[PDB]
């Protein structure tokens, strides 16, 4: 997307695995605020806009 048009997309009613993200072997500045990325997969929250 563009930064004049980064749309607030709603991906819903499915599941997103994050363990392949740590083994993607390409991340540069992977920054998690609030909760640690170790405890991201097991517990989830509402409002999962992207």
């Amino acid at each position, epitope marked *: 997307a563009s930064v004049y048009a980064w749309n607030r997309k709603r991906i819903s009613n499915c599941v997103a695995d994050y363990s392949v993200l*740590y*083994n993607s072997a390409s*991340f540069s500045t992977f*920054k998690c605020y609030g909760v*640690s990325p*170790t405890k991201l997969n097991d517990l989830c929250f509402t409002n999962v806009y992207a």
Partner: nanobody, 124 residues
């Protein structure tokens, strides 16, 4: 809440070998990322070595590429930094840093790290 104790420094000639260590104590399972720093006299503290604890992925700077190795020992709770093929531009104060938020390549000083006391490595 995370205390780092580092050792293994000393003086060695050019072409020699050294092996730094940095033991961790506290909330060990929350720490996801260990990075090694280096601050030369007259230069800014930059990023040299990097290691994700969960993934095992190693990241090295371009000035130390092909020479420097970082390894993790979960049983002794201590990250290592083996010094191979040393040159006299490596005379600096080295620092080990721990992160409980994730990984960031390149290393930056302004992020939140658990800082140690630093070890003097002098080569000539």
């Amino acid at each position: 809440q995370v205390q780092l104790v580092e050792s293994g420094g000393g003086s060695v000639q050019a072409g020699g070998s050294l092996r730094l260590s940095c033991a961790a104590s506290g909330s060990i399972s929350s720490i996801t990322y260990l990075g090694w720093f280096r601050q030369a006299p007259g230069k800014e503290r930059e990023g040299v070595a990097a290691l994700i604890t969960v993934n095992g992925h190693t990241y090295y700077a371009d000035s130390v590429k092909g020479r420097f190795t970082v390894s993790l020992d979960n049983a002794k709770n201590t990250v290592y930094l083996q010094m191979n093929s040393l040159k006299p531009e490596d005379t600096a104060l080295y620092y080990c840093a721990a992160a409980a938020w994730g990984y960031a390549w390149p290393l930056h000083q302004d992020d939140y790290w658990y800082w140690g006391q630093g070890t003097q490595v002098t080569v000539s």
